[PDB]
Design a protein around this ligand. Structure first.
Ligand SMILES: *[C@@H]1O[C@H](CO)[C@@H](O[C@@H]2O[C@H](CO)[C@@H](O[C@@H]3O[C@H](CO)[C@@H](O)[C@H](O)[C@@H]3O)[C@H](O)[C@H]2NC(C)=O)[C@H](O)[C@H]1NC(C)=O
Lengths: 121, 107, 48, 49
């Protein structure tokens, strides 16, 4: 029932920008906080950002702070990641996810999308 | 920031073998550690939350425990279907971090 | 402090919430000192 | 212990009251003293803080 669908990937040049989105359905999107996670080819999982259920407080990884912005539209059940001044090091598959977290998001269930590839070169 | 490490980075085992993966934190994450299993081409699947709480649908052969800085993930009887890279995630404080990941291969 | 407010009113509607305004009065304030991030509703089941 | 033991040898009961004050809601407080209520006069007052 629960689905998360990333889109907006593709190939961009260094110093450019790209906005990702994730469509959520099958659950009460506006009740959960959401995360972005990226995985570069040949690499493990890197946490990128988190936004609270109300779209208020925002958190980012040190590797993206000052360049990436996280947002959400709770009327369209869509999560967004706005990345600007992307570098070659930012090439990765970007996922939207609802990560089980007993301390912050309060999520009791763990959901992941499919992942969208963003290439910078 | 809390740094996470895993050991071994890679292990090989056969069917029925006991497989253990060690994950360490540079700080005290209490019991706040998620264990994920990722197979090629797929998003990570959560197997264990809060250090030792098994997720619904996860086979009884999977288990884990630990507190503070030292955590262990165990498979009591490795199956052909358990070949994957396992990750630990800490969520004591933001930013959240994942360990390097431990690859389990087939002997 | 775990604060609970409550109100009890009659209703003649189904499958929805009523229109109109009604304020909830404070019920109890518990000096507990714990963290809450998740909750679950408890239902009663009969052994029959 | 024996009933005929000297003062320093006799048994004594000890109770120790440890007071914990952390960054948390208080659970134990001493009693509050109240005075009589005065009306129709200029007074200072304190009603439950
Ligand atoms: C309820 O949740 C709050 C918020 O997460 C918890 O507060 C956190 O408590 C930890 C310690 O248990 C704090 O970590 C400490 O930070 C200081 C300063 O950097 C450092 O010197 C210590 O070594 C330790 O890392 C954490 O900062 C604090 N978070 C906030 C926002 O204040 C609280 O403990 C939770 N309650 C319970 C019962 O778990």
């Amino acid at each position: 029932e629960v689905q998360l669908v990333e889109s907006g990937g593709g190939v961009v040049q260094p110093g450019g920008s790209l906005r990702l989105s994730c469509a959520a359905s099958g659950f009460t999107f506006n009740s959960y906080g959401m995360h972005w996670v990226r995985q570069a080819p040949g690499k493990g999982l890197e946490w990128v950002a988190f936004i609270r259920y109300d779209g208020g407080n925002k958190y980012y990884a040190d590797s993206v702070k000052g360049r990436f912005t996280i947002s959400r539209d709770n009327s369209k059940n869509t999560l967004y990641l706005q990345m600007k001044s992307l570098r070659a090091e930012d090439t990765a598959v970007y996922y939207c996810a609802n990560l089980k977290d007993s301390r912050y998001s309060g999520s009791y269930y763990d959901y992941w999308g499919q992942g969208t590839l963003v290439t910078v070169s | 920031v809390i740094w996470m490490t895993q050991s071994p980075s890679s292990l090989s085992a056969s069917v029925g073998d006991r497989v253990t993966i060690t994950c360490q934190a540079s700080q005290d994450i209490r019991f706040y550690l998620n264990w994920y299993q990722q197979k090629p081409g797929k998003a990570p699947k959560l197997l264990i939350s809060d250090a030792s709480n098994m997720e619904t649908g996860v086979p009884s052969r999977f288990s884990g425990s630990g507190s503070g800085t030292d955590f262990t993930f165990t498979i009591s009887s490795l199956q052909p279907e358990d070949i994957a890279t396992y990750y630990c995630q800490q969520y004591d404080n933001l930013p959240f971090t994942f360990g390097p990941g431990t690859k389990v291969d087939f002997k | 402090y775990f604060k609970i407010y409550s109100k009890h009113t009659p209703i003649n509607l189904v499958r929805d919430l009523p229109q109109g305004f009604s304020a909830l009065e404070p019920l109890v304030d518990l000096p507990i000192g714990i963290n809450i991030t998740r909750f679950q509703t408890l239902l009663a089941l009969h052994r029959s | 212990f024996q009933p005929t033991n000297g003062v320093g040898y006799q048994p004594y009961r000890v109770v120790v009251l440890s007071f914990e004050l952390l960054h948390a809601p208080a659970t134990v407080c001493g009693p509050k003293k109240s005075t009589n209520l005065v009306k129709n006069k200029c007074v200072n007052f304190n009603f439950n803080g």
